[PDB]
Design brief:
Number of strands: 17
Main location: secreted
Binding site for Ca(2+): 316-317, 334, 336, 338
EC number: 3.4.21.123
Shape: globular
CATH architecture: 3-Layer(aba) Sandwich
Largest sheet: 8 strands, mixed
Radius of gyration: 18 Å
Helix content: 25-40%
Subcellular location: Secreted
Number of helices: 9
CATH class: Alpha Beta
Bound molecules: calcium ion
GO cellular component, one term: extracellular region
Order of helices and strands: EHEHEHEHEEHEEEEHEEEEEHHEEH
Distance between the termini: 44 Å
Strand content: 15-25%
């Protein structure tokens, strides 16, 4: 009903992030195709939450640099949300922000640069930018997909927001579309939910869907990537598009994204609320950072493992749909994996326990 908001620490608590871990010794890389961040907002923010501020550094890719536009409603919102959510939850981690031109090659080069960076050596890459997989040049999808495969082989986890325009992903050709890079099978695709939670329990968690005007989580079935072997037990449905082909199901996991139960953040000096799947990648990047710290070695590519874990590791979202285009309710949430929320929201301490040697 009435819109609410949480600080990142409140959501981490709801998802039971493992205590006593802050990401020390880990570096989280965050990809950005526009805007920038200002030290004032970040300082004010971390101080407001009582956490020691992580070191944040910028990396220039193809001439692009950290350049805030000063508009709290522009890309500075994406850049600062990413750093504030990931940094508030893995404050001991080092954060490296890679700025690149907003072009197909810039996005690709930012990924390859971050993944192979011998200076910052990130173990995790968080991405909150994208586009309909069918709207990208095929050559770019192939190049970026190979870059994520390379990251997997190197032990670097790559997480990406699934989109904020529902099952149609903003296209109006009357067909359903999943977003890229989330569609890549080598990426931990992050969907979005409406979360009602307090420190001790989750009262309700449903698919984020605020209609055409408020946005909804991306999710569906890839028309490009075949169904992965490790995802064959998830009961991914065939595509809802005529032809009903089989394909990689999106997302893999999901977390709070509804702006109506959004994140309180400080953008360009303004205290406000932001949501979108954009917040989920940084949120779980912080979770992985804590897990890597405890394990003493990076988890790297997690998809295959996550899909073989027991039900206790996730909170199953079973209600809602991510259709903001028509009344067909494509696609719908349900028991088990679904094309709106994947395996659901992770229960941190249980995921960590499941990964302990
Ligand atoms: Ca479900």
């Amino acid at each position: 009903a009435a819109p609410t908001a949480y600080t990142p620490l409140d959501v981490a608590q709801a998802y039971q992030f493992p205590e006593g871990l802050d990401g020390q010794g880990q570096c989280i890389a965050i990809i950005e195709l526009g805007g920038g961040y200002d030290e004032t907002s970040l300082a004010q923010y971390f101080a407001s939450l009582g956490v020691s501020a992580p070191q944040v550094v910028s990396v220039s890719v193809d001439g692009a640099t950290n350049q805030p536009t000063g508009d709290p409603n522009g890309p500075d919102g994406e850049v600062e949300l990413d750093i504030e959510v990931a940094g508030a939850l893995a404050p001991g981690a080092k954060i490296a922000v890679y700025f690149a031109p907003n072009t197909d090659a810039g996005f690709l080069n930012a990924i390859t640069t971050a993944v192979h960076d011998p200076t910052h050596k990130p173990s995790i890459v968080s991405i909150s930018w994208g586009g309909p997989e069918d709207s990208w040049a095929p050559a770019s999808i192939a190049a970026m997909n190979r870059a994520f495969l390379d990251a997997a082989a190197l032990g670097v986890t790559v997480l990406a927001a699934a989109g904020d325009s529902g099952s149609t992903d903003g296209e109006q050709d009357g067909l359903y579309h999943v977003d890229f890079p989330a569609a890549s099978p080598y990426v931990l695709a992050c969907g979005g939910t409406r979360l009602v939670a307090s420190a001790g329990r989750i009262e309700r968690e449903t698919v984020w869907n605020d209609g055409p005007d408020g946005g909804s989580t991306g999710g569906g079935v890839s028309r490009i990537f075949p169904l992965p072997s490790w995802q064959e037990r998830a009961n991914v449905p065939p595509s809802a598009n005529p032809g009903a082909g089989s394909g990689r199901g999106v997302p893999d996991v999901a977390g709070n994204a509804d702006p109506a139960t959004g994140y309180e953040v400080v953008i360009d000096g303004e205290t406000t609320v932001i949501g979108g799947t954009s917040a989920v990648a940084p949120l779980f990047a912080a979770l992985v950072a804590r897990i890597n710290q405890k394990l003493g070695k990076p988890v790297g590519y997690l998809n295959p493992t996550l899909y073989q874990l027991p039900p206790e590791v996730f909170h199953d979202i079973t209600e809602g749909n991510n259709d903001i285009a028509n009344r067909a309710r494509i696609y719908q949430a349900g028991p088990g994996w679904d094309p709106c929320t994947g395996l659901g929201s992770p229960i941190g301490i249980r995921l960590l326990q499941a990964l302990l040697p």
